[PDB]
Amino acid sequence: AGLELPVERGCPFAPPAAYERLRERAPINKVRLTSGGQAWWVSGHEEARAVLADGRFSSDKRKDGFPLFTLDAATLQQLRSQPPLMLGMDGAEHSAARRPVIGEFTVKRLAALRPRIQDIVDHFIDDMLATDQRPVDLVQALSLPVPSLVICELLGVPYTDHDFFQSRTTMMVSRTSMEDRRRAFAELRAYIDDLITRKESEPGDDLFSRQIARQRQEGTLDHAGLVSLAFLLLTAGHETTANMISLGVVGLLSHPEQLTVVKANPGRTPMAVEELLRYFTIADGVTSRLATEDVEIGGVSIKAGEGVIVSMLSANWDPAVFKDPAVLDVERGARHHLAFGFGPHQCLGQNLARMELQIVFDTLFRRIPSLRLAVPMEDVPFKGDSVIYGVHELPVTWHHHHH
Ligand code: HEM
Ligand SMILES: [Fe+3]
Numbered sequence: 001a002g003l004e005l006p007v008e009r010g011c012p013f014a015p016p017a018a019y020e021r022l023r024e025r026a027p028i029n030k031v032r033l034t035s036g037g038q039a040w041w042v043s044g045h046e047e048a049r050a051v052l053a054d055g056r057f058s059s060d061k062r063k064d065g066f067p068l069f070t071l072d073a074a075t076l077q078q079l080r081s082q083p084p085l086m087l088g089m090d091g092a093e094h095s096a097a098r099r100p101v102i103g104e105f106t107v108k109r110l111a112a113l114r115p116r117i118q119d120i121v122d123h124f125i126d127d128m129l130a131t132d133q134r135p136v137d138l139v140q141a142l143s144l145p146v147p148s149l150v151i152c153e154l155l156g157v158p159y160t161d162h163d164f165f166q167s168r169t170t171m172m173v174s175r176t177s178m179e180d181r182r183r184a185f186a187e188l189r190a191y192i193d194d195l196i197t198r199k200e201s202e203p204g205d206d207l208f209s210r211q212i213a214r215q216r217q218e219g220t221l222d223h224a225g226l227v228s229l230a231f232l233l234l235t236a237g238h239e240t241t242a243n244m245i246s247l248g249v250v251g252l253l254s255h256p257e258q259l260t261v262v263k264a265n266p267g268r269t270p271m272a273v274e275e276l277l278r279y280f281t282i283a284d285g286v287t288s289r290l291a292t293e294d295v296e297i298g299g300v301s302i303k304a305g306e307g308v309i310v311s312m313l314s315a316n317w318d319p320a321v322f323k324d325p326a327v328l329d330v331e332r333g334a335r336h337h338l339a340f341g342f343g344p345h346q347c348l349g350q351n352l353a354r355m356e357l358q359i360v361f362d363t364l365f366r367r368i369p370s371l372r373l374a375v376p377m378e379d380v381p382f383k384g385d386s387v388i389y390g391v392h393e394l395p396v397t398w399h400h401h402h403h
Helices: 017-025 045-053 073-079 091-105 107-128 138-143 145-155 159-171 178-200 207-218 223-237 239-253 256-264 266-280 350-367
Strands: 028-033 038-042 287-291 295-297 300-302 307-310 395-397
Touching: 017 028, 028 300, 038 045, 045 287, 045 295, 045 307, 091 107, 091 207, 107 138, 107 145, 107 350, 138 145, 138 239, 145 159, 145 207, 145 223, 145 239, 145 350, 159 178, 178 207, 178 223, 207 223, 223 239, 239 256, 239 266, 239 350, 256 266, 256 350, 266 350
Parallel strands: 038 307
Antiparallel strands: 028 038, 287 307, 295 300
């Protein structure tokens, strides 16, 4: 297996065959990188947690040797042409960047947000129940607009702007035209920049306001840093969630017995959302690291300066922790999944995500119980060649009845 990673996700109900055969060989294997390099590939679940929690495996893209797995040469160069992202800093510097935002995702904080989320979901579910289309693309009706608007709600954009925020955000993930996206971000970075300025003078009940207040009361303002935060949040939480919604439906639909459980008792939904996250693990290899020291792990001696890639999808399908990992079992209480990562960088909005999905799945199947795929499974175009797994478009329908 001189194989060169990454390997495309060809089947949405089983990870690349090569992945399993790699784990069967060892918890950690040195692999070939299509990008040209070479790096360590962690397939074992225990080792996955190990590295992701071990600070010796840096996430700083400013370091020579950082793996070009999910990164371009140009993408790496861009990151080295601006301040580091939270997703790219270590220890103290990281902590300092995360502490001031941890509060925006507490149980209480997110609790007050719930209603706003429900309303957004209900709205689009409505728009669906009134479409003049035979088949409807669940991706453009639900998947995309929901996470984006939920986030702008969080940041604090006025309701009177949802349409704008929805169109630019949606285009920033456009499939065609590298310029449309560029033009999308552009118009947004402008909106957000001024929106914040407005907030500085007469705030409200949003993240922006609360942030501007802390910086003032604490040390001093950082307009750019705040503008940067907004995008970090939108960026790391829009497509991931969207794709999770898409795959969540397809997964639930392709497993009736499981869908009935969720549809029968909504209290079982939260645990179902966890199984769905493990099952698909759409962030698979975004957890690339750069060893800054020599480390003995997984029975392998990793030398400093070498790249380390943690495969979350591989860890979440590790049979040594998840009995029959190949089966979609909403019932299993198997905690410890890594779809959200592990360690210092574990997903900051993992709970906002859990909330969205939970609300989306319940509402969707409660309001449109007979929802089914408008086309055969093999026809649904999955984003199997994308860094973050998902589905390009998902045609669907339901039964319009009479009494
Ligand atoms: C919906 C599915 C989502 C998945 C699967 C997901 C997954 C992840 C993963 C795996 C990481 C760690 C990456 C690494 O360590 O290199 C991460 C980080 C992060 N995610 Fe998400 N995420 C999701 C949604 C969100 C949402 C909704 C937000 C909030 C807007 C969010 C905010 C973040 C932030 C800020 C980080 C960086 C944390 C840090 O640097 O310490 N994520 N996410
Ligand atoms: Fe009726």
